[PDB]
């Protein structure tokens, strides 16, 4: 999603549903291919040891002057009318200047944004309404003109414009926690395996201290651990190597 071919608009963002997977976020933080890396509520190094229920990478592009609007505790046109984030947004926002990718000769005017709306959106509420409404008491009957604006306007992503107008491929990684079980987690880094020596072991299921040595015990395909006759852990199958 960060290096996708084409992005969506700011009000019709492509919500990529991410679930039941892992990812080493330090690689993206040190990828040297981004313009902004700001995680709110949790650092990129702290979230590597945390799990989440659902992760939605909202794909869209905005101008350089509008990057500040995409953050918790910030208001604006896009922060209120096109894409509203919660006041307690615990996700992370990442962006990259795509002036060499999205902009073209004459300017890329495919990314649209609404200048207003009948009411402010809710957290993570998408709207794709292209209807032209009336401002005053004189009904315009569809088309704009005489006090009835057209909210949809195209972004001016030109290749020679200033940095405040250039495109930035903002990818709002919406991390949330719902009633469902946790599916997404960080990189489960491990250490080297030691055999035939007294070493303290720490598996995902159980922990303890003892000498890990091979034996003729045959665990079932689903059995990860084993206990003795006294219902006490005396054997364990390594999760990496069978």
């Amino acid at each position, epitope marked *: 999603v960060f290096n996708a071919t084409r992005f969506a608009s700011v009000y019709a963002w492509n919500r990529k549903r991410i679930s039941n997977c892992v990812a080493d976020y330090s690689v993206l933080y040190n990828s040297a291919s981004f313009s902004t890396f700001k995680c709110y509520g949790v650092s990129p190094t702290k979230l590597n040891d945390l799990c989440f229920t659902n992760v939605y990478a909202d794909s869209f592009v905005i101008r350089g002057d509008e990057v500040r609007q995409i953050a918790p505790g910030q208001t604006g046109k896009i922060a209120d009318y096109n894409y509203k984030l919660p006041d307690d947004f615990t996700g992370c926002v990442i962006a990259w200047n795509s002036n060499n990718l999205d902009s073209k000769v004459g300017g890329n005017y495919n990314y649209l944004y609404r*200048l207003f709306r009948k009411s402010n959106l809710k957290p993570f509420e998408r709207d794709i309404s292209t209807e032209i409404y009336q401002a005053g008491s004189t009904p315009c009957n569809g*088309v*704009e*003109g005489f006090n009835c604006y*057209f909210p949809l*306007q195209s972004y001016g992503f030109q290749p020679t*414009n200033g940095v*405040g107008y250039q495109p930035y491929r903002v990818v709002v990684l919406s991390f949330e926690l719902l009633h469902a079980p946790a599916t997404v987690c960080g990189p489960k880094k491990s250490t080297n395996l030691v055999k035939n020596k007294c070493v303290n072991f720490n598996f995902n299921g159980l922990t303890g201290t003892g000498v890990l040595t091979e034996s003729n015990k045959k665990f079932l395909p689903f059995q990860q651990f084993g206990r003795d006759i006294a219902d006490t852990t005396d054997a364990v199958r390594d999760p990496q190597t069978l």
Partner: antibody, heavy 117, light 112 residues
Framework: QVQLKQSGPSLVQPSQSLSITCTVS????????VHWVRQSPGKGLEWLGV???????DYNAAFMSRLSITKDNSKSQVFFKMNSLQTDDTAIYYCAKNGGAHAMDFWGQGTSVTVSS | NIVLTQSPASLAVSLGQRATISCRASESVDSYGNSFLHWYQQKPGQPPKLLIY???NLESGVPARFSGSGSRTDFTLTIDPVEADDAATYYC?????????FGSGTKLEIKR
């Protein structure tokens, strides 16, 4: 990308009628309107009229009955019908793309229309 | 009637300073959530170009040095920093009441 250069008229006489052809390119004419102005005839930049997003039209209070605009989607050009032209109507005319809040984001190169017999 | 009494008539500002251009309006207001107007910049060698739509969001094509605010009737354009590319005539167009006429026109000159 957006091009709104004017052409067609060369020289008009007073008390006559002729249309200025503003060639629309770079955007859907059905999705955006086309404005029409002239380059500061005495007072500041005088707004003449605008074509709505595929509907009716609005014009200046003074040029309400004098000037008219008509769009031709088949040729991708908008015709600015002029009527009752006088010697004071000599100025450089421009057209622009209708923005979001009735704005004029992109502007054309225009053309100098001279009114003289 | 909407008498767009735009002032000043002209300016001669040096480099690195701040220029101010006011714009008055009569009607209308409270369209959807605001009552702001549009600002433009007519260079001597280029047609006008939109500066700020709704007087609170910058428009592409022009440099991002333009900003300002305004009341329901009075509006102001803040040009900061005044540079050698700001030599142009600025305008103030109505957007919520026919006719969409511009202001009187403030010609900004750069003391090069």
């Amino acid at each position: 990308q957006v091009q709104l250069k004017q052409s067609g008229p060369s020289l008009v006489q007073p008390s006559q009628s002729l249309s200025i052809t503003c060639t629309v390119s770079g955007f859907s004419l059905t999705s955006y309107g086309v404005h029409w102005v002239r380059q500061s005839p005495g007072k500041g930049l005088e707004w003449l009229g605008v074509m709505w997003r595929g509907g009716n039209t609005d014009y200046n209070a003074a040029f309400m009955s004098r000037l008219s605009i008509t769009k031709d989607n088949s040729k991708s050009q908008v015709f600015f019908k002029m009527n009752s032209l006088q010697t004071d109507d000599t100025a450089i005319y421009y057209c622009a793309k209708n923005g979001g809040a009735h704005a004029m984001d992109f502007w054309g190169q225009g053309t100098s229309v001279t009114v003289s017999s | 009637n909407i008498v767009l009494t735009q002032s000043p008539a002209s300016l001669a500002v040096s480099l690195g300073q701040r220029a101010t251009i006011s714009c008055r309006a009569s009607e209308s207001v409270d369209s959807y959530g605001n009552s702001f107007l549009h600002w433009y910049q007519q260079k001597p060698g280029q047609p006008p170009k939109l500066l700020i739509y709704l007087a609170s969001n910058l428009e592409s094509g022009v440099p991002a040095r333009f900003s300002g605010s305004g009341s329901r009737t009075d509006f102001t354009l803040t040009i900061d920093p005044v540079e050698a590319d700001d030599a142009a005539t600025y305008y103030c167009q109505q957007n919520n009441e026919d006719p969409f006429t511009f202001g009187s026109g403030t010609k900004l000159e750069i003391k090069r």
